[PDB]
Structure formats: structure tokens, C-alpha cells
């Protein structure tokens, strides 16, 4: 459940804004969310929400667990070069390492008095009974060693030294200074400078095979020795277990894989000899994946946690193989459906990992996983994350599926994701855009809705009026109704007189149309009627009206002004309209006086199809440069003479 978990991991992926990103942050945002979910149901809620919060504590841990000379040397520089010149062993070491008492000290009083003691040391304990000294520090060899077993997988041994020293031990704590290799200004040259004195043991391999004899010593009870196993590489002696789970096995496992193989490596560098053991050395190299099959069969109690399976696979370093088993699973089967965090958490990482390493996510397994997530979002009853996860979707799968999701229109930030699956999946004139009311330039009608909000409010009213004049020449005043109710309100300075000449550009277009229109009702009402009963005062006026409406007295069809926004296609377009329609009306106006029943507003007699000449000479529409100097203008003196004799 926790649909708050989903929001908290889908915002990080992207407030879905576009900026440069380094996708390490998206792991950190994921960890920050994981801790806080893991708290908010781990102290309120029921108790199944404490297991839900236990799972999310695993998720945190795993996102923690992705991250984490030459010439003659001691054993110290060998070990450094080892870790230098491989990085799968260096990581293996980092895994096993990653996850208060008050004691007055002293002994040896009470021991001599009852019986024998005879020599002071905790080696008296080892010649015979471990009851021979004080028995409330026999207590401490169990108990403070138990604290030490939590500590060593919390890292370090010098931590464990400081607690060994409170354990009333002061010569059995020398064994934890023994674990140091020789670091010296006599035999190292880059460890001769952070130390100016001798450190560790240069018989560190005879130390290792002698602290390994104690790991099997049968006078030593398990609550001492289990750390002596571990100091020479960990045999699983059951008190290096305190968590006993999948990862507690694996730490002690991996400890022994490195501890066999360092002696081998030191047989190349020759720190192993025949004076360097009391017990013959295990020069068998140990394999990671096979000891994981031991672990896997041992704990089918951690096969139910898929996150614990994600944890395993990064130490394998086999990320495509897990990601391909968690979508279909294996091969066309359902078996990935029985953990409820499998299909979620491995979905999130498939996205975010593909941007880190793009061989690491197969990229087909991303595709299948976000589809699986989107169907489960369909069944959630969410529908404002089905956009967010179908950006990553492709036109091959879920074309029309996303069409019909994105049919409903909603919240501003969600419209930004809408656009980025609409025009991403290339659907512009399908059946998104009519299932908005029920439920190629169609989408320009629908693409002037997106501009009202900020950050594209400065580009808003600019593009609106552009798209008006683009499909006003083509023609579509029904659709011009839908750029003028999808019109941005603001266009002043604080949006950015600006744009308010366009208001009048529509109005001088109607002065042009009426002029074209009035030639129809001329052939009807004038030129087929030639009778009188007070009909002169009705048909002779109609002819006059059309003469008064075909030029704007100031200037017709010119604009270039400052109440117009910048562009020279607001000047040209008016010019191109002017030259195509202005001689069309002069051809119309010429037959309105020569073929009409009444030739003027006098039935006979003509003078005013010879005063067209003055009407091209006028600068009310400047029709003296709209007829070119020769071949048009010359032939036009022929034209009004031609029609002056068309009255006859």
C-alpha cells in the first residue's frame, strides 16, 4: 500500500520540470523517503505496518549497499596493492564490514587464597579449569564478547579492542593488536610517513594460523573463540550469528573467501613459508555465487523479501539477471506477483539505473516493468501517475492505451506530462481530442490551452494570434471561435499596448466582404426590376450604398503599427489581400452601372463608370501602385471606356 510511497518516488524522477541532473541524487531522495515512510508507520498504525516499515528499512539498507610502492616491501604494501589492483575483492571487504559497561579491572587476589593460583595470567585458566580466578569476569568473557560480535560487522577491530580492554582482559587484548600487519619506516615507504615507529606483526601469517588453532580449541567455549574464527576468516561457529538471517551468513562466508586468497596472493609475494604456520594453510580459492546458493537454500525466509534478493545481486554484480527475473516471471509466467514491493521498487530502479549504466538495465526490462506498474496504477485508482510512467513508454507498446487515458483533461502540471505523452507518442488528430467532451491542425485548436499558465505566458498571446491568421487564410472562422475563447487575457507589459490592432484587422476584413456581398442583391433587386410605383426610391439607393463601402477613407488594408506586435508579415499579408481583392471589386463595381436596369440613380445616362479613374488615383487605398505603371494602368484607361459603351 502506502500510495504516499509512490508519490515520494515519482516526484524525484520528475514538480516535474526539465533541468540537467546527475541521477545519484535520485537515489538519495529515494533513501530520504524510505527512512520517513519507515518511521511514520513504525510507531503508529497496526503491527503489519511495522513489517511494511521493516521492508522499507531493507530498501534503505540496499540503497546504502550500492556504494559501499613496488621495489621491496613488508606485508603492509602487499595488502594495499591487492586491494588497489582489483575492485571486486575491495567491494567484498566493504560489504562484510558494513551493517557502555563500567568495569573496575583486577584479578589474582581471591584465586591463591582458596587453593592454588601460583602464577598470575589468564593462561592459568588454560592449563586447567576456567573457574580458577574470579568468576564474575568469567561472566565478562561471555557477555562483553557478545557485544564484540555486533561490533565486528559494524566494522573495525580497534573498536572491539576498546571493549576487550573493559572486559577485564589485558593480555588477551594483545590478540587484537596482533591483527595488525607490519607498518614500518624500515620496510614500507608510503607507510613510513603516517607512522614513524613499528606497528603490527611481521610474523602475521604464523599469528593467523595460531589464532586459527583457537577457533577450534575445545577448551575455549564458543563465546570467546567466535571472534578468533573471524580473525583468520570466519568459520560459522554460531556466535558469529546474532541476527541469523541471509546476510549474517553471507558476512562470515565472504570473510573466509578473502582470507584464504590473501595467503595465496602472499605466497606470490612470499609471506607464507613453512615457519609461517602451526597448521597447514587453506590454499583453495573460494567462489562467491556457489556460497550464495548455500545461503539461498538455507534461508527461504529471506526469499520472501525481494529486497534482500536485490541486495545479493549487487555483490554478485549481476543486475540485468535479477531485473529480467522480476518481469515476465522467468518466461511468460506469474510468480513476481507474490511480493508487493517487487513490481514497485524494481520498477523505480529500472528507470533510474538506466540513466546511470545503460547496459545494466536491459532497456526492454524497463519497458515491461513500467507497463506492469501502470496496470497496477490502473487498479490502484491513480490516474495522475499513468502519464508520468508512460513518458518512458514508447510508440510500440501502449499507443492507443495512452490515448484513451490522456483523453481526460485535468490539473496544470499534469497537462505538461499530457503534452509530453501526446506529441511524444505522435497522436495529433486521432481520438484524444474529441473524447474531452464525451468523456493536422486539430491539436493546434487544443494546444492553445497549455499556454495560459506562467513561464509560457510571455509566449502565449504571441502564438495565439499567429495561429489565428494561419488558418484564417486557409479559412475556418468556426475554429477561429476557438482561438478567441482560448485567448490569453493579457497582452499589456506585465504579461511580457502591444496587441490590439488585430481587433481592427478583423473589422476591416468585414468592410471588404460586404462589398463583395452587395453585388448579389444588385442582380436580384436592381437589374431584373424596371418598374415604378415609388420603386426608384428603393433600387436607386441600393446602388449608392455599395459605392460608399469598398474603401476605408483613412487607409484601407495597411498595418505596420506599434499597437501591432513586431513582424513584417502583419504588413505584407494586408498588402497581398489588398492586391488580390481590390481589382476584383473594381471589376464588380463596373457592372453595377452598365448592366443594371437603372444605369446611375438616373435610369439613362452615364458619367460615373468614367470616374473610376479618380478612384484609382485616390490614396484612400492607394490604387495607383496597385496597378502597375504600364500594361495594367494603360489598359485600365481602355477598361472604363469599354464599359462606358457596355451601358449601350
Amino acid at each position: 500500500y502506502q500510495t504516499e510511497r509512490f508519490t515520494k518516488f515519482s516526484d524525484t524522477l520528475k514538480n516535474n520540470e526539465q533541468n540537467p541532473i546527475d541521477p545519484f541524487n535520485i537515489i538519495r531522495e529515494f533513501r530520504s523517503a524510505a527512512g520517513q515512510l519507515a518511521l511514520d508507520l513504525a510507531n503508529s498504525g497496526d503491527e503489519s505496518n511495522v513489517i511494511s516499515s521493516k521492508d522499507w528499512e531493507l530498501e534503505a539498507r540496499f540503497w546504502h549497499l550500492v556504494e559501499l610502492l613496488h621495489p621491496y616491501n613488508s606485508r603492509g604494501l602487499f595488502e594495499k596493492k591487492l586491494m588497489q589492483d582489483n575492485k571486486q575483492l575491495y567491494q567484498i571487504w566493504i560489504v562484510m564490514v558494513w551493517l557502555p559497561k563500567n568495569v573496575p579491572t583486577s584479578k589474582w587476589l581471591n584465586s591463591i587464597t582458596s587453593g592454588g593460583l601460583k602464577s598470575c595470567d589468564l593462561d592459568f585458566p588454560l592449563r586447567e579449569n576456567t573457574n580458577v580466578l574470579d568468576v564474575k569476569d568469567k561472566e565478562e568473557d561471555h557477555i562483553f564478547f557478545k557485544y564484540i560480535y555486533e561490533l565486528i560487522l559494524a566494522g573495525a577491530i580497534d573498536e572491539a579492542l576498546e571493549e576487550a580492554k573493559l572486559s577485564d582482559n589485558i593480555s588477551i587484548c594483545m590478540i587484537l593488536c596482533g591483527i595488525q600487519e607490519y607498518l614500518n619506516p624500515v620496510i614500507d615507504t608510503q607507510i613510513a610517513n603516517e607512522f614513524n615507529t613499528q606497528q603490527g606483526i611481521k610474523k602475521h601469517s604464523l599469528w593467523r594460523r595460531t589464532v586459527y588453532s583457537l577457533s577450534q580449541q575445545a577448551g575455549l567455549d564458543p563465546y570467546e573463540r567466535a571472534i578468533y574464527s573471524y580473525l583468520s576468516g570466519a568459520i560459522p561457529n554460531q556466535e558469529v550469528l546474532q541476527y541469523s538471517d541471509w546476510e549474517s551468513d553471507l558476512h562470515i562466508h565472504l570473510n573466509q573467501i578473502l582470507q584464504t586468497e590473501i595467503e595465496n596472493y602472499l605466497l606470490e609475494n612470499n609471506q607464507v613459508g613453512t615457519d609461517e604456520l602451526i597448521l597447514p594453510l587453506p590454499s583453495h580459492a573460494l567462489t562467491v555465487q556457489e556460497v550464495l546458493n548455500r545461503v539461498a537454500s538455507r534461508h527461504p525466509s529471506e526469499s520472501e523479501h525481494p529486497i534482500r534478493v536485490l541486495m545479493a545481486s549487487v555483490i554478485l554484480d549481476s543486475l540485468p539477471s535479477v531485473i529480467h527475473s522480476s518481469v515476465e516471471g522467468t518466461e511468460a509466467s506469474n510468480d513476481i506477483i507474490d511480493k508487493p514491493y517487487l513490481l514497485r521498487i524494481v520498477t523505480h530502479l529500472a528507470i533510474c539505473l538506466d540513466i546511470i549504466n545503460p547496459g545494466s538495465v536491459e532497456e526492454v526490462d524497463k519497458s515491461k516493468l513500467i507497463t506492469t506498474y501502470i496496470s497496477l496504477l490502473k487498479l490502484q485508482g491513480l490516474y495522475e501517475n499513468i502519464p508520468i510512467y508512460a513518458t518512458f513508454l514508447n510508440e510500440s507498446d501502449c499507443l492507443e492505451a495512452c490515448s484513451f487515458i490522456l483523453s481526460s483533461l485535468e490539473d496544470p502540471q499534469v497537462r505538461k506530462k499530457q503534452i509530453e505523452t501526446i506529441n511524444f507518442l505522435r497522436l495529433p488528430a486521432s481520438n484524444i481530442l474529441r473524447r474531452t467532451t464525451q468523456r493536422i491542425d486539430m491539436h493546434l485548436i487544443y494546444g492553445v490551452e497549455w499556454l495560459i499558465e506562467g513561464k509560457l505566458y510571455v509566449d502565449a498571446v504571441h502564438s495565439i494570434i499567429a495561429l489565428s491568421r494561419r488558418f484564417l487564410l486557409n479559412g475556418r472562422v468556426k475554429a477561429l471561435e476557438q482561438f478567441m475563447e482560448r485567448n490569453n487575457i493579457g497582452e499589456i507589459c506585465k504579461n511580457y499596448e502591444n496587441e490590439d490592432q488585430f481587433l481592427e484587422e478583423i473589422t476591416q476584413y468585414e468592410h471588404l466582404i460586404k462589398g463583395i456581398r452587395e453585388y448579389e442583391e444588385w442582380q436580384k433587386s436592381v437589374s431584373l426590376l424596371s418598374s415604378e410605383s415609388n420603386i426608384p426610391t428603393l433600387i436607386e439607393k441600393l446602388q449608392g450604398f455599395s459605392k460608399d463601402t469598398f474603401e476605408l477613407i483613412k487607409t484601407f488594408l495597411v498595418d505596420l503599427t506599434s499597437s501591432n506586435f513586431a513582424d513584417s508579415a502583419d504588413y505584407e499579408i494586408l498588402y497581398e489581400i489588398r492586391a488580390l481583392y481590390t481589382p476584383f471589386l473594381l471589376m464588380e463595381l463596373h457592372k453595377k452601372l452598365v448592366e443594371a436596369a437603372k444605369l446611375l440613380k438616373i435610369p439613362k445616362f452615364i458619367s460615373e463608370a468614367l470616374a473610376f479613374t479618380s478612384l484609382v488615383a485616390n490614396e484612400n487605398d492607394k490604387i495607383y501602385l496597385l496597378f502597375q505603371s504600364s500594361g495594367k494602368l494603360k489598359e485600365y484607361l481602355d477598361l472604363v471606356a469599354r464599359t462606358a459603351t457596355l451601358s449601350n
Binding site: 476591416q508 477613407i553 506599434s562
Partner: protein, 485 residues
């Protein structure tokens, strides 16, 4: 957050220099004071809550002397003060005993003052200029004779303007006075501009506090100060537009000059003082064709110069000071001949020149015939000749179908017919019948009426965003047809 208020409920009324006698800006007395201006901070945050319930509703908002709001019987403008250095060359050998030890403590006390004045100043700023806010909201709430305690307090704060005469906090004594006699000061205070200001006009690169100040200083209820100050402002004020795009606040400060201690009937000496100087008659040329200063002629220039000649032509002497020195001039100096010489100035194509020729340029010349004009006679005949083409078109143009007309153009012909009427009466030493026919024709035809006349300018669309548009058109044709022969 954190916020800059903090400490304690109102019920304390001091942080004077009276209680803590003038021994200040160096010592513990001042320290009580600066943390007292933290007090007054939280008290006036509390009084912001009283303005948010001035809006909503509250029992007896006014309360003086809710909470009482009188609590400063002096405001301090004393740190703008006290010199800190040049007690410190004495310091350079002092120390030998306990009279030195007294000395040395007074100068260490001023290394304390060096912190404390910075604090002080931020905090009296938060204090005082918000006290004024509170005062003003009390005034716009219903008047009481406790907003005359406002008179009692403002008076003590223009006499504590003087101690100097900085000036960018001097407004806590001007504009408070302004709310009093606006809803319903001190001659002395208002002299301060004629004292300080005078060193120029150019070197308005630090004159912005003076302008702010001056504005609200002009409020008084003629000033001899007024004639003097005026020779520099909006005589030589406006010169700088020929020494530059014309600018808002010149013509606005003119409006404040109009409203000051009586100038209403002194219109004669204002017009004279303006006429003597050659300016205020150079700017006319900008609308003609701007290039006097090499600023390229854009019709945006006209939009502001319009408001200028408008605010002039109201006042009949200031109107007349212009006709001779040439308006008939400016018309003849015209930039375009496709937009002032055609028969009807159309909203289509450039409604800039369309707003201009309607509002001004007709109503100005009419007013000049509203005096039962006897002076303007040849100039106005000449001006019917000039636009002879427009007189015959504005009659003729209309059929009973004539689209591409606006309410604006109707106004222009109201203007035009009104002018020809007065011209004929007022000399005392025709085809209008056409437009009477046309208008009846559209009257009896409501459909052609409503349809042909259409909105074009931005203004007009808002005239349909109640349909006050038609309302305008009715009262229009009333007066138009009344004046028409």
C-alpha cells in the same frame, strides 16, 4: 521565518527621549530603548491584526489616548547624529588613574554605539513609518474628534523636522496631515522646500527624494513660495523633454500645482508666467514631427502630449496662451497625410491617430469658441478650409449600410458639426440634410443600427464586457442630431 518582531502584549506607552532624558545613543538607556522598539514592533504587528479586522468587522475599532494607538508623544528622526570619532585622538594617550578610567569608559561606550545605532535605525524604521499606516486606516474609517488627536501629534513632528534644514524619512508629518484635511498643514513646514531644494532644477540624479516629498507638500488650504518654486518646476522642469519621449510625472505635478492654496482663479498670473518664457510651446513640435532632439517620430509620443495639451486647455487663460503661438501651426506641420487629411479618420489602421484627433484637436478648438469667441475668428475659418474634405465626407460617407464605423467616429462628427454651428454664430460678420436622412434611416432600422456600428479599439470591446456600448451610441446621436442642421 524567523520573523523580526518578538516580545510582549500592548499595554505600555513609552520609548521616548523624555522619560530616558536626552543622554543618548551610547549607553544602557538606549539599550532599553532599542529592545523597546522590538516591543513596539510586536505591538504594531498586533495592530496589523486590527487592520485585517477593520476589513471584517470589530467592536469599536477607534480607540485613542482594539487598544489605544496614541503611545508616541515624540517621534525621533535623530539618527538619520552623534559623532563617534574625534573623541579618539584624546584616547591616544589616556589611562593613568580613575578619571582616565571614566574617560576610557565613555569612548568604549561609543564602540558600543557603533553597533547600537545600526540596530536603532532599522528598528525605529519598522516602528514609525508603520504608525503612520495605522493613522491613515483610522481616517478612512468613520471620523471621530479623536482623529484630531492626529492634529495634536503631527504638529510635534514637523518642529522635530527642524534640527537640520535626512529627507527620505521626512514624510511622517506631511502625508498624515494630508489625510486630515483630505477627510475634512503648517505653513512653516511647507516653506522647507524653498529653503533646501534650491541649487538647480539637470542634477536630478539625487533629486528623487525632493520629488516624492514635494508632491504631498502641495496640499495646502495664493502662496508666495508658489510663484517662485514654479519658475523652476514645470517651466524649466518640462524643458528637459526638448533636452531628452514625454514623461508621466511632469503633468501629474502640474495637477498638484492646480490644487494648492487657492490657484483656481489665479489662472491669469499662471498663464502669464508661462507665456513670458519661450518654453511650453516647444513641445508642440513633437506631435508635428519629433526630431528636434533627434528622437524618431513614433505615434506613441502623441499619446502623452495629448494629455499634456488637454490638462492645459481646461484652464481658459492657459488655453489661450497657446492659440496664437500656434496650434494652426502644428496641424500644418503634420507628419502624415494619410491619417489627418483623409475624410474620416478610421480606427482601422493605427487607432493611435484615431483616439488623438477625436479627444484632442477638436474639443480644444471648441472650448476656444465656448467663451462666445471673438478673438479666434480668422484662425477658425482657416481651420474649416483646412479640413474641407473632412467636413464634406463626414456628412456624405453614411449610407443606410456603412460598416467600419465606431462610437469614436460618431464622437468626431459630433465635434465637427458642433464646431461649424458655433463658427457661424460667433463670426456674425450646407448638405447636412443628407446625414439627417441617413441617421433617421438607421434609427427606424434597429437591426442595421446594431449591426453596422461595431467595436474596434480595445476600449470598445470592454464596452460590451451590460452593453453600455449602445448607451453611448444613443446619447451620442441625440446630441449629434440636435446640433445638426
Amino acid at each position: 521565518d524567523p520573523k523580526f518582531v518578538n516580545s510582549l502584549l500592548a499595554k505600555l506607552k513609552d520609548s521616548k527621549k523624555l522619560f530616558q532624558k536626552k543622554e543618548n545613543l551610547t549607553r544602557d538607556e538606549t539599550v532599553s530603548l532599542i529592545k523597546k522598539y522590538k516591543l513596539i514592533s510586536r505591538i504594531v504587528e498586533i495592530f496589523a491584526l486590527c487592520i485585517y479586522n477593520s476589513t471584517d468587522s470589530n467592536s469599536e475599532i477607534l480607540n485613542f489616548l482594539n487598544k489605544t494607538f496614541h503611545d508616541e508623544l515624540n517621534l525621533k528622526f535623530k539618527e538619520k547624529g552623534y559623532d563617534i570619532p574625534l573623541l579618539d585622538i584624546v584616547l591616544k594617550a589616556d589611562r593613568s588613574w580613575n578619571e582616565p578610567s571614566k574617560s576610557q569608559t565613555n569612548f568604549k561606550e561609543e564602540i558600543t554605539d557603533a553597533s547600537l545605532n545600526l540596530q536603532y535605525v532599522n528598528y525605529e524604521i519598522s516602528t514609525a513609518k508603520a504608525w503612520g499606516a495605522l493613522i491613515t486606516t483610522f481616517v478612512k474609517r468613520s471620523t471621530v474628534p479623536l482623529n484630531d488627536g492626529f492634529v495634536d501629534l503631527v504638529e510635534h513632528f514637523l518642529k522635530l523636522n527642524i534640527d537640520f534644514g535626512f529627507t527620505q524619512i521626512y514624510l511622517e508629518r506631511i502625508e498624515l496631515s494630508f489625510y486630515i484635511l483630505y477627510s475634512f498643514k503648517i505653513i512653516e513646514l511647507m516653506n522647507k522646500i524653498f529653503t533646501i531644494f534650491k541649487s538647480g532644477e539637470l542634477k536630478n540624479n539625487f533629486y528623487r527624494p525632493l520629488l516624492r516629498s514635494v508632491l504631498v507638500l502641495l496640499e495646502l488650504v495664493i502662496s508666495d513660495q508658489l510663484l517662485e518654486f514654479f519658475e523652476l518646476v514645470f517651466s524649466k522642469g518640462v524643458y528637459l523633454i526638448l533636452s531628452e519621449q514625454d514623461l508621466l510625472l511632469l503633468l501629474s505635478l502640474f495637477k498638484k500645482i492646480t490644487n494648492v492654496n487657492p490657484s483656481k482663479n489665479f489662472n491669469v498670473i499662471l498663464a502669464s508666467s508661462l507665456n513670458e518664457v519661450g518654453t511650453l510651446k516647444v513641445i508642440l513640435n513633437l506631435y508635428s514631427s519629433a526630431h528636434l532632439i533627434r528622437i524618431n517620430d513614433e505615434p506613441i509620443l502623441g499619446q502623452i502630449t495629448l494629455t499634456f495639451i488637454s490638462e492645459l486647455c481646461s484652464i481658459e487663460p492657459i488655453a489661450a496662451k497657446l492659440i496664437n503661438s500656434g496650434l494652426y501651426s502644428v496641424l500644418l506641420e503634420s507628419p502624415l497625410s494619410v491619417a489627418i487629411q483623409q475624410g474620416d479618420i478610421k480606427p482601422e489602421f493605427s487607432p493611435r491617430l484615431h483616439n488623438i484627433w477625436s479627444n484632442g484637436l477638436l474639443s480644444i478648438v471648441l472650448l476656444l469658441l465656448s467663451q462666445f469667441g471673438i478673438k479666434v475668428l480668422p484662425e477658425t475659418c482657416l481651420f474649416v478650409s483646412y479640413f474641407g474634405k473632412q467636413i464634406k465626407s463626414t456628412i456624405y460617407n453614411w449610407g443606410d449600410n456603412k460598416l467600419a464605423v465606431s462610437s469614436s467616429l460618431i464622437k468626431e462628427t459630433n465635434q465637427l458639426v458642433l464646431l461649424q454651428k458655433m463658427l457661424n454664430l460667433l463670426n456674425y460678420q450646407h448638405d447636412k440634410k443628407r446625414l439627417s436622412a441617413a441617421l433617421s434611416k438607421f434609427l427606424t432600422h434597429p437591426k442595421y443600427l446594431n449591426s453596422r456600428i461595431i467595436p474596434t479599439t480595445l476600449e470598445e470591446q470592454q464596452q460590451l464586457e451590460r452593453l453600455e456600448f449602445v448607451k453611448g451610441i444613443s446619447r451620442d446621436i441625440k446630441a449629434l442630431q440636435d446640433s445638426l442642421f
